[PDB]
Ligand binder design. Structure first.
Ligand SMILES: [K+]
Ligand SMILES: [Mg+2]
Ligand SMILES: [Mg+2]
Ligand SMILES: [Mg+2]
Lengths: 220, 170, 142, 148
RNA sequence: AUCGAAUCGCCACCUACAAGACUGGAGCUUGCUCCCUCGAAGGCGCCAAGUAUAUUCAUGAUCACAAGACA
């Protein structure tokens, strides 16, 4: 929440709404480690990145094997005083954040700034839905990274069985979002068709040598 | 199944390397990884070995046997007329366009920029007229809903008197 | 005595007299490539601070990076007070807290299009790591 | 031939007179102009534009701050003889819109001749629009791969 | 109101979804044939509101943060 001083300064200066350049990444069907490595390098290079749908990441192997790995991680604990010991997060977004954090120099101010430049969500929240098209990382997608014969796990199920408590809520929110977006996209089809028709018709009205140039460069 | 199989006489297109974007004919299959490719039409496509990871099969297959002679291959290509059919496709036109764009000068890029802008301007003209007849944009849809409710109550006696006074005042 | 009456008459005229228009960028042109300061040349033993490494957008091969050898490079920041600048008296409109440090591209670095940069005299500050670097198109070889 | 001769030059072949160039620095960065001549003793180039199209006047510029394209205009019948270093010489000032009549007349004559040559050349309308255009570096552009 | 600053693409056509061992549609002969919009382009934006013989640009004097920024 902004302070009254900041609001007063903004009113005095008389400026418009400002949004920094932010890249939104849809992490569905992505390999956890490779995605984390790419994101960490980009953060160190100085980008602002927001990742969505963290509950649909993939890890190679079997769900039982990865759950056992997580339980082995959970065993680690400072015996003398556990309140000071390692803190084990169960949400998929927190899992991804920790994985990225392990690939950064987290004990320097540069590393902390890079880490704070990252925001992670489960599903797609309303404040991110309408901000523009999302991107993918081609060199970290399952259908080009895993051989299809081998089994794989989905991070959401593993988190749900090791202690995450909001899988059903996330599923219901995702279903509602998809239904709403589908209705909106079913609308405006007439507008899209009208624009396509107008572009098709403009060729007969534009000058002929311009038509020839477009044909020569393949945009006809 | 709409997937083009690798077989003798199948036309392919090279993906990467110095022979990028050229076409050739498969004349023999070595193993699961390599094939032999030749094309008498192109001057850089003598018989040679290609790895199967660098090949995109096409939809045309000439009828030849494995390890066919050069004369047999040339005669089959002309009879099939596969090169003429391929040259008329949309993807073939896209490849030639990319070559033209990579060699263009600064003046030619200006000419393309003019042609694109001329098309976009005429697209807006055509769209606007149909939009006025049938309302499809966000602002014209709002006008259609607003006019019907606004008009019925703007005909009030007080509204007319206030409007007349306001217009007369200006 | 209600403002709803005058507002909707303005709205009826506003959204009925408007046509299909687009935003056209006719501002001052930009004549440099955008880059980022990755850091200094280094090994496992430590860093060497008199050479800097710069990553430039759309430059992803060693042959691409060769095109930029000899070009001028600028890093732009601001201070706390207004100090002397070029054309301090000839053009008083330039006076500002904005400042710049200049350098040149020396050679490529690696196979991915990174470049090595040398700055005039002193070295670039470490507070510039991860921030914007300008790469101009002059001196021109074409 | 002699290095001390005023006719000595080492200018690259692309910057021939009559070529169209892109200005990379200075007040008129991004505009396109026409190269007229090179001043003696391996001096700078002189460009006009002309001013009616893009607002560039007759000006000096170093060859390292332009990009010479392969598009050319035949300017043989322009007679760029009066353009000399004397016209660019400035009187010293001691102990401390506005254009001289001679400079204005020279600009008028040169601009008229250049406009006539451009109109007489083929593709004249396209060349005029090209001279009116403005050059900028857009996101996603890779000028290091282009042919000029 | 100190405040001078670094940042230099925007859209109410991307901003909905799913699959890479099957993507426009059929046919049997199951890898070939036939039909189509021909199956490797989000739309704009880069100096006349649009491709036409219209129009003010200097002396800011050869580079200098871009002396300019609500596209
Ligand atoms: K603990
Ligand atoms: Mg570590
Ligand atoms: Mg001078
Ligand atoms: Mg400035």
């Amino acid at each position: 929440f902004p302070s009254r001083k900041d609001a007063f300064r903004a009113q005095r200066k008389g400026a418009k709404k400002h949004r920094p350049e932010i890249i939104v990444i849809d992490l569905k069907d992505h390999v956890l480690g490779r995605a984390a490595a790419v994101v960490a390098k980009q953060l160190l290079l100085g980008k602002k990145i927001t990742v969505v749908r963290c509950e649909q990441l993939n890890i190679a192997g079997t769900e039982i094997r990865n759950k056992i790995k997580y339980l082995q991680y959970l065993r680690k604990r400072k015996l003398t005083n556990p309140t000071k010991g390692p803190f084990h997060h169960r949400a998929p977004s927190d899992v991804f954040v920790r994985t990225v954090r392990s690939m950064l120099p987290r004990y320097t101010k540069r590393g902390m700034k890079a880490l704070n430049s990252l925001v992670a969500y489960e599903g797609i929240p309303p404040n991110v839905v309408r901000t523009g098209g999302r991107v993918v990382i081609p060199r970290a997608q399952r259908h080009v990274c895993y051989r299809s014969e081998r089994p794989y796990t989905v991070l959401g199920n593993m988190c749900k069985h090791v202690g995450w408590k909001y899988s059903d809520v996330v599923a219901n929110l995702e279903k509602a979002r998809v239904e709403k977006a589908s209705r909106h996209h079913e609308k405006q089809a007439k507008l899209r068709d009208a624009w396509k028709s107008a572009r098709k018709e403009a060729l007969a009205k534009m000058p002929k040598h311009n038509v020839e140039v477009l044909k020569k460069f393949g945009y006809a | 199944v709409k997937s083009h199989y690798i077989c003798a006489g199948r036309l392919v297109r090279i993906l990467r390397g110095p022979r990028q974007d050229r076409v050739g004919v498969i004349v023999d299959i070595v193993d699961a990884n390599r094939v032999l490719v030749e094309n008498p039409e192109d001057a850089k496509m003598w018989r040679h070995v290609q790895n199967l990871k660098n090949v995109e099969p096409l939809k045309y297959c000439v009828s030849v046997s494995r390890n066919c002679s050069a004369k047999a291959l040339k005669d089959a290509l002309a009879s099939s007329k596969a090169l003429e059919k391929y040259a008329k496709t949309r993807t073939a036109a896209r490849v030639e366009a990319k070559k033209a764009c990579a060699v263009s000068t600064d003046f030619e890029r200006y000419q393309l920029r003019v042609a694109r802008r001329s098309r976009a301007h005429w697209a807006r003209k055509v769209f606007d007229e149909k939009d006025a007849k049938t309302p499809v944009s966000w602002h014209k849809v709002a006008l259609k809903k607003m006019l019907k409710k606004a008009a019925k109550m703007d005909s009030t006696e007080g509204a007319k008197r206030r409007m007349q006074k306001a217009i007369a005042a200006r | 005595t209600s403002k709803v009456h005058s507002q909707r008459s303005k709205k009826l005229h506003q959204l009925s007299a408007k046509t299909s228009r687009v935003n056209r960028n006719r501002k001052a042109p930009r004549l440099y490539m955008k880059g980022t300061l990755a850091g200094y040349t280094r090994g496992l033993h430590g860093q060497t601070k008199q050479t800097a490494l710069v990553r430039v957008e759309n430059v992803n091969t060693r042959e691409d990076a060769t095109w930029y050898v000899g070009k001028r490079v600028c890093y732009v920041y601001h201070g706390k007070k207004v100090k002397r600048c070029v054309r301090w008296s000839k053009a008083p409109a330039r006076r500002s807290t904005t400042r710049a440090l200049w350098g040149r591209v020396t050679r490529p670095h690696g196979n991915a299009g990174m470049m090595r940069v040398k700055f005039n005299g002193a070295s670039v500050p470490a507070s510039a790591i991860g921030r914007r670097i300008r790469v101009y198109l002059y001196p021109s070889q074409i | 031939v002699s290095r001390k001769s005023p006719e000595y030059t080492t200018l690259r072949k692309s910057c021939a007179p009559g070529a169209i160039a892109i200005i990379l620095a200075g007040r008129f960065r991004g505009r396109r102009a026409v190269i007229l001549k090179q001043l003696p003793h391996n001096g700078p180039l002189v460009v006009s534009g002309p001013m009616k199209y893009n607002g560039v006047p007759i000006r000096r510029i170093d060859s390292r701050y332009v990009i010479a394209t392969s598009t050319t205009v035949d300017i043989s019948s322009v007679d760029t003889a009066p353009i000399t270093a004397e016209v660019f010489q400035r009187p010293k000032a001691e102990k401390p819109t506005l254009v001289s009549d001679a400079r204005a007349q020279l600009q008028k004559k040169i601009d008229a001749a250049l406009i006539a040559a451009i109109k007489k050349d083929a593709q004249g309308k396209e060349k005029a629009g090209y001279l009116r255009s403005v050059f900028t570096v857009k996101p996603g552009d890779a000028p290091h791969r282009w042919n000029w």
